[model samples]
Target: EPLDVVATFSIIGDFAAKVGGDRIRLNVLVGPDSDTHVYEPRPADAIALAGADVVLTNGLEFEGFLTRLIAASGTDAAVATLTDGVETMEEPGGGHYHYIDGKAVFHAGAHDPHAWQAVPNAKVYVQNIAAAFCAADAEGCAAYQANAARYIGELDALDTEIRAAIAALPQDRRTVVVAHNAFRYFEAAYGVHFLSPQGVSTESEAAAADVAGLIREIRARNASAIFAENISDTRLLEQIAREAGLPLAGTLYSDALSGPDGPASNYIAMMRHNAGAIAAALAA
Candidate 1:
């Protein structure tokens, strides 16, 4: 019988599919092009969790509503935290702060849960999924392990490719601009420095002050790349960058993967697309 699996979001769902293969009936709480940062748990999600054999969460408080939802679901499921073996980054200012309507809004957590941004850490996610599957369904254990082994090889090649691409960039051009600090893990593993307006999240418009300060900081750091992730205030950010003088680099698949037919439809495609885009931008 397929394990009734519940993954918290698109990226992790993709991982489960890769490792679980035909052995899992996966229900991803947050779907493609969705924001997990502010994802609300639907009543359907509770029912899904109620029947799950295993519930996979990113588990650095990434799913803000998970704890309450699971308690309510009352399912006899092993809640597996995928970041178990990952080297996590501590949250700055005790949590992440982002400017919203020029007001500081805090997403409080002790650590960053965006470990999947790092390919090596993603391997750990696969490992955890495999382990979780083996614990739940003893017979399918080998299949899960074999699937993870193959997927991890793909991830290693992806990591190597990204490393080589990043290595090709001049050291001076590594600092880049993004909307939020969701990429601290990526920044830590890869040599790129990502700069964002302090306390800025996807919800905030670049206030006049925020925009001016961002330009100042970008200039101050000689930041080379300005990229599009999933953000709402890009127009203003782009306007100032065009005025202050840096080109829009391209899209990076940040919090979510693209729709199934799109370039970043899967985790591997997403990373490859991001690395290729960043490499091409910084190469110049």
Candidate 2:
């Protein structure tokens, strides 16, 4: 029997493929560059969920509409949260909050939804996926476990490499600026300091006053570079770079995966690609 699997978005979908392999039929609802934060569930999505044996999601409030999605699907499929065992980071400036649609979103009641930013935490996601698979399809438990172990080794290596890359940069050049604050985990894990006008996720727009403050900070701090996010509008960063007379570093992928052939198609690849791009930009 083909086990029908549903992954909430691209990152989890990619991880599901590695472990589920040929044993499962997977459906990834949110495609590349789709923001799960602002995603609205559709009727067709509910239909897909109704038949699924398992639904994988990045649980930390990342998918704001998931509750409605599941309710709409009315499916009894076991919902698996990929971040189950990971220790999530709190918002640095008190609870990692955001304002959306005139409502304030609080991280105090939840973990940082972007746990995949940390490669080691991504291992936790894979572990959770494997466990979910074992429960849903006992026949494939061993296979999933074996695949998880192999992929984990690769993730571990990627984590080590990221640390080494950060360590290679001169201490003075370690700080960089980004358009959004999505990289707290990456910054926390690798000793790189990231400053952004927007916090954690780019779903919210930064105010002009906020942007001005950040630009002043960038110049005052003698920050090495400023980066744009693959998922956000770049006009703000472009304006900041031009006004500050600093060269734009490049782009960083956050919250979503790149297309299959892009540099950041998977979790491990995403980390390496971002680190390499940022480091190279700083060197230039």
Candidate 3:
């Protein structure tokens, strides 16, 4: 019998599929291009959680609605966090901000939830997912272990490739601008600096003060270029570029993977696309 596993979002869903292989029936509550940060629970979502044998979440407040969804569904399944043991980065300009139930909630002081932005941390996520799956289905322990081992090897190589690309870039050109501040861990791991107007999640637009500050910073640094994002709005980045009189480089994938036809449809491809785009922009 196939074990039923419900992942909160697409990325975790993809990871679960890789680790579970043919042994688990995977269901994702929020699929690709969906924003888990501001996701509203639906009747079908509640029912899905109720029937799931296990649930996977990125945690660290990434899925703010999970607790409520689980509670409403009265699910007894083990709620596992894929980001266990992965150190989270603090949001530079503050933390995530969201509005829930007509009340404004500021989550900026909390740890950033995009730890998977760094491939090394993604390895930790896979490890945690494997452990969770093994614990839930001890009979399939060997299968999960085998699959996880293979996937971990790929992740290691991805990490190496990313480092090599970053290492090849000149130090002065290592810094680049993004729409959202989702690359702190990546910067820490690969020595590339990412500047952004909106912090962590692009759930909210940048205020006038924020935009002014970013424009000043861009001009002061003589930053290479401002890149748009697939998972966010590009208008603010455009405004920033216009304000700073800098050229718009290219689009970057952050927080979520692109469609299957897009260049960055998965973690490996996403990193490659990001590096290639940044390098090209800097060289221009």
Backbone clashes under 3 angstroms, per model: 3, 1, 1
Which model scores highest in TM-score? 2
**What are the TM-scores, per candidate, against the unseen true structure?**
0.90, 0.92, 0.90
| Per-residue alpha-carbon lDDT of candidate 1 for residues 54-96, written as tens digits (9 for 90 to 100) | 9999887778899999988998999899999898776777444
Residue 34 in candidate 3 has what lDDT?
Answer: 63
Location of the lowest summed lDDT over 10 successive residues in candidate 2: 104-113
Per TM-score, what order, best first?
2, 3, 1
- Model 1 TM-score (2 dp): 0.90
Winner of 1 and 2 under TM-score:
2
Tens-digit lDDT track of model 2 for 1-284: 96899999988898999888899999999888677767787788999999999999988788888888888888989999888888888766654466566676653555667888889888999999999999999998999999999998999999889888878887777778887778888877887778888876556778988877887888777788788877777898888888777888788888778888887888777777899988887666
Candidate 3 accuracy as TM-score: 0.90
- Candidate 3 yields a Cα-based lDDT of 0.82
